Amino acid sequence: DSCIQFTRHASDVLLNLNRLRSRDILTDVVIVVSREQFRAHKTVLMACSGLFYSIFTDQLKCNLSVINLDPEINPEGFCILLDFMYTSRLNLREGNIMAVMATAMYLQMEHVVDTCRKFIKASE
Amino acid sequence: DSCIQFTRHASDVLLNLNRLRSRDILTDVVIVVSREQFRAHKTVLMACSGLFYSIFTDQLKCNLSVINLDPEINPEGFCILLDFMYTSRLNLREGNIMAVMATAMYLQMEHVVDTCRKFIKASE
């Protein structure tokens, strides 16, 4: 109502969360993707992905410190999506779009799937 | 470089973090302010406040599930600042500006202190 807003707040919060991840501060889960490990914060994963939201709201899976993804998942595809979760920037290229799209479908990140479909249709 | 950006990403992440707080999902700390308790996520507090960043990077304080603030701190002032951390909106009013400013000085949130000083100087 009588609220004022700090424009850069949400992006500053995101940048600071990424610095915590980068420095391994308060990370509480290891995501394993075909023998490669990625440290992260469960709250950030839940806040970006429908799959991680369903995993960490489960009464048993919420307690796990290690989550293994389907080994057919591309770790570069996962890494591109994890970087997007922590920064808002999606490094989408001709050489990775198919892997990024398949990973976003798996992670239930519809906005990413949508942009991938648009970039593919523009190329065809 | 070849990155695309989802404009609403950071604000969607923040809104989802606030929904997790509201539903008490993965909250990992209780902030006590003159016998009133506020549940939160340590990572969000660290990402917004210099004081919480110093507390939760300390090798002993990082393990505490309860943090007591100075009892002279105003809980409404704290609540306004916690709501700002989780939403980007600061409910700054004539009746609370002095308490909000003192709380922001204590929490080391310089951008909030700055806007308070500007609103006070405009009134004088």
Partner: peptide, 5 residues
């Protein structure tokens, strides 16, 4: 986009 319930 993803919005939590």
């Amino acid at each position: 986009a993803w919005v939590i319930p």
